[PDB]
Amino acid sequence: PPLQAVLVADSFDRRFFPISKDQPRVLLPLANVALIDYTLEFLTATGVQETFVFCCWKAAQIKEHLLKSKWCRPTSLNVVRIITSELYRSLGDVLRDVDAKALVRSDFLLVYGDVISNINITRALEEHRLRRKLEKNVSVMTMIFKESSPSHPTRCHEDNVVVAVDSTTNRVLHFQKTQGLRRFAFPLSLFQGSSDGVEVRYDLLDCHISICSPQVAQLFTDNFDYQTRDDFVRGLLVNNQIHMHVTAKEYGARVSNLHMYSAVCADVIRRWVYPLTPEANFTDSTTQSCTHSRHNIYRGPEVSLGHGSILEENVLLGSGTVIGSNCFITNSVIGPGCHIGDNVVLDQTYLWQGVRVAAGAQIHQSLLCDNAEVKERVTLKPRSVLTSQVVVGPNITLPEGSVISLHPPDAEED
Amino acid sequence: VPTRKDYGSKVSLFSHLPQYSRQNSLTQFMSIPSSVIHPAMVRLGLQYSQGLVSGSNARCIALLRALQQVIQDYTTPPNEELSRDLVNKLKPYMSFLTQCRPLSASMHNAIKFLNKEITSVGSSKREEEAKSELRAAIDRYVQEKIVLAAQAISRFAYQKISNGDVILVYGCSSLVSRILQEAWTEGRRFRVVVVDSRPWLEGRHTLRSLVHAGVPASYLLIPAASYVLPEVSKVLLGAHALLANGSVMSRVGTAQLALVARAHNVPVLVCCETYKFCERVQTDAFVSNELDDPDDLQCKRGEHVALANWQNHASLRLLNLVYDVTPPELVDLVITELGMIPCSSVPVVLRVK
Amino acid sequence: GSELSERIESFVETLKRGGGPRSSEEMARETLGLLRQIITDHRWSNAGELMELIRREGRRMTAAQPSETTVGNMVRRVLKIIREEYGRLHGQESLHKLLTSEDFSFHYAQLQSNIIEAINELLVELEGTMENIAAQALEHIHSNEVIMTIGFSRTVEAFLKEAARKRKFHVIVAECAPFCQGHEMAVNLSKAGIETTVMTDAAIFAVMSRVNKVIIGTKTILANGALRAVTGTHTLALAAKHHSTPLIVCAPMFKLSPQFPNEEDSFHKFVAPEEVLPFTEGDILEKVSVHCPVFDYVPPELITLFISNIGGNAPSYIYRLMSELYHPDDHVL
Amino acid sequence: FLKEAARKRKFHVIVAECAPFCQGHEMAVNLSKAGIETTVMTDAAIFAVMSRVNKVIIGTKTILANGALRAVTGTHTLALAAKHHSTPLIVCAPMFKLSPQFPNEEDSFHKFVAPEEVLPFTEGDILEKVSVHCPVFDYVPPELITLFISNIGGNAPSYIYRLMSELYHPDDHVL
Amino acid sequence: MEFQAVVMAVPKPLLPVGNKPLIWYPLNLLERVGFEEVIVVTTRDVQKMKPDIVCIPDMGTADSLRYIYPKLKTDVLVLSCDLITDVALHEVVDLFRAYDASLAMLMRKGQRDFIGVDSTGKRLLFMANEADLDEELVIKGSILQKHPRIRFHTGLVDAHLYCLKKYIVDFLMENGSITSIRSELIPYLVRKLDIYSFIKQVRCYVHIMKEGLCSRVSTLGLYMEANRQVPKLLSALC
């Protein structure tokens, strides 16, 4: 049977609210490429032949970006079907609508609109199909995990989970979030079935990828109170089984907040998601061509680097850029068509398309969205966010954690 | 004490070297309360066999501490002199330790120094006084041969490091790490390129040691050394022993790195103390080396292991070398606690002391 | 027909995404077949339009993967073949031509047919190349000889297994650290009883004093006789030059690229750092730069001989062979 | 050295006989009498088989003050061939073969014997117009030597200058 | 020397197992591996290597180990009188010598207690009893941060074979609030005045055989099973 996928584009949360009220989260440029493009590339690379993209919040922009993409071309092997509806509220509603329309016919894929990964789900799919052949209707869902470390920058945030899995047959017996928990509590019934091998895993990075069965949509339709996948997993274990699969030589991560975005971008620029690299140009576009150079230096066409400037570490320079003299750019990504002044020091920054920076600025660990302008003698402290069309005046030093947009009540106004 | 058994089929070129297995040990055929061998010596041999102490100065320090404990627990029998009795008693311990793992040059020098110190004990000296004096001599040796000898080398190597340098290191070395940390603490600003190799992968012991200090460090494997060398300013290498002919005996990936560094006009620097100087000579890694566990070359690439069952193939041999020898013409500078001397002044230091 | 379009797109994505044909011979064969299907399933009045479309296809194929030079080599070979056929049916630069001295708009009917037949011969030559290198085994390997090889090469494997049925010698295989493919070659050689030994790269120099000859292969050969080999091969060449050990290269004719070593910063193939440093290291991965280059550059002065389907040659003659395979106007493609 | 290393090891030995004084045949017979798999060859083939030799071990008549050697003729060619293939060259010589003299006494360093060994007397009338020279010894530079084995152990040539200072007085160099 | 064997029998040690005394089985295990002298803490009626019998007037394991405190001078090897096994003793002390462990216990699989052994199978991280747990299992955060993988076992049988250091004996002697060390001290030692003041960290290791006798008799069924399967044990032993 042809492999299908369900791409939930609309992320029903407000983590990027100052940037979400202007454009959806699945259209934010990670490395000058949209996150939905990364997700579609990951889906097409593993063998998916049909994708159902559900868009609720700002569906027009996502729809036109998809029609302008490569996966919607007549020569593509992964058919993309944009199913937009205006009264979607959570992933449970999307799965209930899928069950109502009967779109899926076999074990499909469940991912979000922002999932950067190069995992090829064939071994996990074969295991999920073989396990469902022995048992009648067991193994309704198989979650994909990645071996990681509790100290890795990508695995230190809200998505920290702890599972109690059977080592003989990989099956999730417990699932909970460690948000603000000094100690974890596990029920004693877990040791009632096997009592031979039961291990508690804390080195699993949640990739938010699932190989599901058509029974998952039916269970979501039955239990109307189910909203997200975590609720379903937590409610199914207390009452069908849920298994898992762990990879150790592939990358997978879902962008959910700002620091997760930073870690994912730093991994993408450092070729950790190979072959998905900025120099590969997997989107097959003419405005995103680039050349790779030593120390992971990504140089686009006609960047016009100035004399005296130094590219020390992993940097990405888009097309149409122009950089002044005596600049120090490191560990940062610069969008296409930017104008940098002189004696500017950029470190761990993220400049989107159309950002203009005057001479004398010092930006460290800050995000500058589209059409952001910085005047002379401006210092941006780490974790400072500048949304679109924000022009910070001169001789002004922003504190740490400064978020300024055109809207009054988010954090601050222009 | 039963002799250790050989494991696997050794290479024809290295058929004169012992090859043991880490899984099997000799403690299976010994007393649980050790009688013939001292319990501290048995613990040290077990740690050497299991690889818990896998350094050069650490092995010497552990051996000297075990010897101090043995001397403290030593009691001279009647009708016998301590000078000969202790020397005759410490020989089976060294034989057992060699059976556990081939001794290093630092351990050999420490054993020789301790034997000389014990033989140089007077007859009229009391037992407790002689034991305390031997312990104090071992402590002074540890202090002025490893601790005090490292500060001088760190101070001598500080004036050779400049701002903006790209130092290339290899494997795990206490002296190199200490030198780099002290140079970064003094105020020198540079970056280090760490080179590693299978199967020990001990270079990661240095990498995470630099990140915790604040030095910008990079990581790569030894087959990709010719790619990063064009940007390397100088190469800092550690030495396990300096032979009397100027050759450097060190980790197997040292002479190769020194040879590839010569083709890129990169100066090669060697750091070693004067207590590791050997009066013997050696021209190749074939006459004297160490054959580690050949089962460490197995790696899981993809789904299966290509070397899962290598004993089934008769004509299949697995070579796992440990040490290698670098000729003196590939070494530019040797840093010791006496000063920055060339690689040809090794016998001179052997003659002065 | 659009079938050719689907085939071209599938081949482009198979080259760009991951690894398709896991052997250079099959890659060259499918490249030649796809070029033949393009020549047949397309309308071109004169040779100019055909050459232009073939050049565009080869350019996009090399843009899909720059390191896979076999596709570009086959494209340039097809271009040269078209050029000879056009020059023959119609009627290099040197000093003689510069002292004693053109467009493809003319149309010919049977020309295409001829071209096809020409491609045909090349096809058959492929299934000879490997054995055309293997049959020259006994001429370069004598009994009781120590031989060292690095990585996994089908050509060197066939060479050794053909030289072992009548001689008996010693073989040492140094496994590459990122991709330990030398273990597979070691097992395949030990399955034939050749007294094979396995070692790491760090010991390549250590045992270099007890090796009589080194025999290796490569991914492609440059125009000046240089090599684009697997990483760690430059160290092996340096060690062989230090001990004056002859270094033999087994490579067929479809591994000759007219390009010169001037495309730095893209010569080596960089893969994910997961092979060198694992992901489970911890928080140190955010301050450590890890690079894993797959290929490396080997200068021509460290090579002794080149064994190909035409026989044994010296590097100082490679410049001629290129001139006998490709046209100077097809170097940039 | 070879007959003591053969009672516990087994290796290959090749002996190149000198053309004027073919004394290598006697050593080859003495080695083959102990079962060491000895081979005999000429000097012209010294380079030809040099690619299949792991180590060269020789002796000498005397050692100069700078580490140089006064060996039998044809030894400089062997040292050059060993340096071309980076083959280690070991010298077995006791302590009484150290001379404080330096290579500055040319035209008398080599020992010249009658030309009867090179060209026989029964050649004819051509002996009156042909100059025949038969030098017995030759000079070997110190940079072509790897190690020196003596009764005190193994040393490098770059240390020979010290050993001389430990055996003779600077006022007795000219004697 | 290196160790000091102590066997407590508080009768059962005189039960005929193959027309032989029960306490004879540990004593035979103590021999054939050094141990030219042993300490025995038994009752008054329990009377018969160089055994050193000690007569005890409850008096569990802890207050009996601290009752012979002036007799112990080195590391202790505590066993029980009711124990029949074929284990190679070195396999336990190899975890006590190389790693310098504070505690080395021997256990086996049973053909209630939760044991959180780590991935390597030797280091002991978690050890709790079902009677002490109220409703669920509680695991600290730092333990899971340092060791992300903790394999739990519940069908294990304890052999009461413990190699302990001397400062642990000093702790048991100074603090008279611990009895039945197997149920009170071992979970306290795994939990990491305190013991740190007596040390002049704390590491606990566990060995498992899975293919041996390692049977500590405590009831009628275990006694009859030991009687039934001791024959070829003696055939391989005597």
Author numbering:
A (entry chain A): 41 to 279, 285 to 459
B (entry chain E): 167 to 519
C (entry chain D): 8 to 98, 106 to 115, 120 to 351
D (entry chain C): 177 to 351
E (entry chain I): 1 to 10, 24 to 61, 71 to 79, 83 to 136, 155 to 235, 261 to 268, 297 to 334
From the reporting publication:
Refinement of this class resulted in a map with an average resolution of 2.6 Å. After docking the individual eIF2B subunits into the recorded density, we observed significant extra density next to both eIF2Bα subunits, indicating that two copies of NSs are bound to each eIF2B decamer. Interestingly, whereas eIF2α-P forms extensive interactions with both the α and the δ subunits of eIF2B, the NSs mainly interacts with the eIF2Bα subunit. Thus, despite binding to a region known to influence eIF2B’s conformation, an overlay of the NSs-bound eIF2B and apo eIF2B shows that the overall conformation of eIF2B in the two structures are virtually identical. By contrast, the eIF2B–NSs and eIF2B–eIF2α-P overlay shows major conformational differences. The surface of the N-terminal domain forms a hand shape that grips the alpha helices of eIF2Bα, akin to a koala grabbing a eucalyptus branch. In this arrangement, the N-terminal domain extends three loops that contact eIF2Bα. The first two loops sit in a groove between helices α3 and α4 and the third loop just below helix α3, effectively sandwiching helix α3. Together, the three loops extend five aromatic amino acids to contact eIF2Bα. In addition, the side chain of NSs H36 and the backbone carbonyl of NSs T35 both contact eIF2Bδ R321. NSs is an antagonist of eIF2B’s inhibitor eIF2-P, deploying an overlapping binding site. Whereas eIF2-P shifts eIF2B to its inactive I-State conformation by closing the angle between the eIF2Bα and eIF2Bδ subunits, NSs engages the enzyme to opposite effect, binding to an overlapping site with eIF2-P but preserving the angle between eIF2Bα and eIF2Bδ and locking it into its active A-State conformation.
Phosphorylated eIF2 (eIF2-P) inhibits translation by binding to eIF2’s dedicated, heterodecameric nucleotide exchange factor eIF2B and conformationally inactivating it. eIF2B is a twofold symmetric heterodecamer composed of two copies each of α, β, δ, γ, and ε subunits. eIF2B can exist in a range of stable subcomplexes (eIF2Bβδγε tetramers and eIF2Bα2 dimers) if the concentrations of its constituent subunits are altered. In this arrangement, eIF2α binding to eIF2B critically positions the GTPase domain in eIF2’s γ-subunit, allowing for efficient catalysis of nucleotide exchange. eIF2B’s catalytically active conformation (“A-State”) becomes switched to an inactive conformation upon eIF2-P binding (Inhibited or “I-State”), which displays altered substrate-binding interfaces. We here provide cellular, biochemical, and structural insight into this question, showing that the SFSV NSs evades all branches of the ISR by binding to eIF2B and selectively blocking eIF2-P binding, thereby maintaining eIF2B in its active A-State.
